[PDB]
Scaffold this active site. Sequence first.
Site, short mmCIF file in Angstrom:
data_model
loop_
_atom_site.label_atom_id
_atom_site.label_comp_id
_atom_site.label_asym_id
_atom_site.label_seq_id
_atom_site.Cartn_x
_atom_site.Cartn_y
_atom_site.Cartn_z
N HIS A 162 -7.19 5.33 4.11
CA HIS A 162 -6.88 6.35 2.82
C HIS A 162 -8.14 7.35 2.81
O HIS A 162 -8.48 7.64 1.67
CB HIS A 162 -6.91 5.49 1.47
CG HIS A 162 -5.79 4.49 1.22
ND1 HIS A 162 -5.71 3.29 1.54
CD2 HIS A 162 -4.48 5.10 0.96
CE1 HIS A 162 -4.59 2.74 1.35
NE2 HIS A 162 -3.85 3.87 1.01
N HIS A 216 -1.85 12.76 -3.65
CA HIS A 216 -1.57 11.48 -4.09
C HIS A 216 -2.52 10.32 -3.92
O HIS A 216 -2.36 9.31 -4.63
CB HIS A 216 -0.09 11.17 -3.53
CG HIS A 216 -0.39 10.52 -2.21
ND1 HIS A 216 -0.33 10.97 -1.08
CD2 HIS A 216 -0.33 9.04 -2.09
CE1 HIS A 216 -0.30 10.08 -0.09
NE2 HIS A 216 -0.23 8.88 -0.82
N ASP A 217 -3.58 10.48 -3.14
CA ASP A 217 -4.69 9.53 -3.13
C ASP A 217 -6.09 10.09 -3.36
O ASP A 217 -6.86 9.48 -2.74
CB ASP A 217 -4.43 8.78 -1.71
CG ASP A 217 -3.39 7.63 -1.58
OD1 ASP A 217 -3.24 7.03 -2.59
OD2 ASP A 217 -2.56 7.79 -0.42
N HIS A 276 -4.15 10.44 6.12
CA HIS A 276 -3.17 9.84 5.60
C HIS A 276 -2.43 10.71 4.89
O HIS A 276 -0.97 10.88 4.90
CB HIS A 276 -3.58 8.56 4.99
CG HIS A 276 -2.49 8.04 3.95
ND1 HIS A 276 -1.39 7.56 4.28
CD2 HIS A 276 -2.62 8.16 2.40
CE1 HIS A 276 -0.80 7.12 3.35
NE2 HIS A 276 -1.44 7.36 2.29
C1 LIG Z 1 0.82 0.23 8.88
O1 LIG Z 1 1.09 -0.98 8.00
C2 LIG Z 1 0.80 -0.78 6.70
C3 LIG Z 1 1.00 0.39 6.12
C4 LIG Z 1 0.80 0.52 4.58
C5 LIG Z 1 0.54 -0.78 3.97
C6 LIG Z 1 0.29 -0.97 2.58
N1 LIG Z 1 0.41 -2.13 1.91
N2 LIG Z 1 0.40 -1.93 0.67
C7 LIG Z 1 0.91 -3.44 0.18
C8 LIG Z 1 -0.01 -4.44 0.43
C9 LIG Z 1 -0.29 -5.65 -0.62
C10 LIG Z 1 1.14 -6.28 -1.10
C11 LIG Z 1 2.30 -5.95 -0.28
C12 LIG Z 1 3.03 -4.61 -0.38
C13 LIG Z 1 2.24 -3.67 0.27
C14 LIG Z 1 -0.25 -1.15 -0.27
O2 LIG Z 1 -0.06 -1.17 -1.52
C15 LIG Z 1 -0.81 0.41 0.54
C16 LIG Z 1 -0.75 1.66 -0.38
C17 LIG Z 1 0.44 2.22 -0.65
C18 LIG Z 1 1.74 1.90 0.17
C19 LIG Z 1 1.53 0.95 1.20
C20 LIG Z 1 0.17 0.49 1.67
C21 LIG Z 1 0.56 -2.11 4.56
C22 LIG Z 1 0.58 -2.07 6.08
O3 LIG Z 1 0.85 -3.16 6.91
C23 LIG Z 1 0.69 -4.39 6.07
C24 LIG Z 1 0.64 -5.48 7.18
C25 LIG Z 1 0.46 -6.91 6.64
C26 LIG Z 1 1.79 -7.75 6.29
O4 LIG Z 1 2.39 -6.87 5.13
C27 LIG Z 1 3.13 -7.73 4.59
C28 LIG Z 1 3.68 -7.27 3.33
C29 LIG Z 1 4.48 -7.79 2.29
C30 LIG Z 1 4.98 -8.93 2.76
C31 LIG Z 1 5.97 -9.69 1.92
N3 LIG Z 1 6.30 -11.07 2.09
N4 LIG Z 1 7.16 -11.42 1.12
N5 LIG Z 1 7.37 -10.19 0.24
N6 LIG Z 1 6.47 -9.45 0.81
C32 LIG Z 1 4.41 -9.56 4.08
C33 LIG Z 1 3.71 -9.14 4.85
MG LIG Z 2 -2.05 5.36 -3.16
ZN LIG Z 3 -0.80 7.05 0.26
#
Ligand SMILES: COc1ccc(C2=NN(C3CCCCCC3)C(=O)[C@@H]3CC=CC[C@H]23)cc1OCCCCOc1ccc(-c2nnn[nH]2)cc1
Ligand SMILES: [Mg+2]
Ligand SMILES: [Zn+2]
Length: 333
Positions: free
Chosen positions: A84, A124-125, A88
């Site tokens: 971040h 945005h970040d 990004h």
């Molecule tokens: C280059 O790869 C990424 C890029 C961005 C992210 C992010 N992540 N996140 C979140 C992380 C926690 C909860 C899941 C939702 C996404 C952010 O808030 C970040 C800030 C804003 C925008 C997206 C960013 C995550 C990236 O890889 C994450 C790889 C790890 C596995 O991830 C999964 C994610 C959900 C599932 C799941 N299973 N059932 N339902 N849901 C299973 C596995």
């Molecule tokens: Mg953000």
């Molecule tokens: Zn962002």
Amino acid sequence: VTAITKVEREAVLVCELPSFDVTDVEFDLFRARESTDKPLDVAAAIAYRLLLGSGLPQKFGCSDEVLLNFILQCRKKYRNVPYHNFYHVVDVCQTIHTFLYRGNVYEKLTELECFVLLITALVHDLDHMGLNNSFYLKTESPLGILSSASGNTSVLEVHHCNLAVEILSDPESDVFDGLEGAERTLAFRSMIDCVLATDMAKHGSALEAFLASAADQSSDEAAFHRMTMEIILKAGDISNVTKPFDISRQWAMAVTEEFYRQGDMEKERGVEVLPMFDRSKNMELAKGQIGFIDFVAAPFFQKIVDACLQGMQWTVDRIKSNRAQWERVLETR
Ligand SMILES: COc1ccc(C2=NN(C3CCCCCC3)C(=O)[C@@H]3CC=CC[C@H]23)cc1OCCCCOc1ccc(-c2nnn[nH]2)cc1
Ligand SMILES: [Mg+2]
Ligand SMILES: [Zn+2]
């Protein structure tokens, strides 16, 4: 905030970006950053070129110098964290540019809305410290306590909006200074609504609202426009999996390292560490990307493309190609 200097502007303006097409869906920001020893200047020049190339700032009374000052004031508020950081937000700006103009989403929006979305990408970040909203709430940090007390759990997103408003309160860095009345109000409100919609705790509800509006021929027009903006910024923010595999992999490495650093700090404070943030769990990159694809990104992109944004079909195709490539990584391990 302190004024941007002539010398600061000139260090961006010398960057010529030879051999890069900043408008292209296969543009490679990692290669751009490796091309010189001043990657922060190259990153600012990419953002500057995208914004001038759109032809939009000119139309709304934003001079070249005010644009560049704004870019540099945003840059100063990004921190040296693995994911971040300024790279990004430039990436999100570039990606949105492709959705608008290669995917023809500009057709659904006014010129002002397009301009707001490109600017919003860069704010945005602001001042992200590599810790998510959950971290502030679990540790009862001061910012978390303030968020809970004031009734809004989007700890970071409110913070980002505050800092955007601060940058824009000085005419020398206000890219909306050429607007007045309702246009000015729309610019600020739409920027703030979009930033607030990037909180992933609101992912499902933001997507569902957009889809219901797209399916309704009698949807309020202003509401549809606003949701389309929100959805495009969200799309940019989860677009890493829509890029050529090696670019996608480099983003995945940066985000993993940022998550592990959060988990390391959470251990030290004795608060809950989710598996995804735990170094000692050793979780494989491939499995994590496949999971993010299957449960977040593939359904999001397929649903918005099918509902409305047909020109963005390439995102769905590239996600599918990346998923197959990660499956080959597993097959050969
Ligand atoms: C280059 O790869 C990424 C890029 C961005 C992210 C992010 N992540 N996140 C979140 C992380 C926690 C909860 C899941 C939702 C996404 C952010 O808030 C970040 C800030 C804003 C925008 C997206 C960013 C995550 C990236 O890889 C994450 C790889 C790890 C596995 O991830 C999964 C994610 C959900 C599932 C799941 N299973 N059932 N339902 N849901 C299973 C596995
Ligand atoms: Mg953000
Ligand atoms: Zn962002």
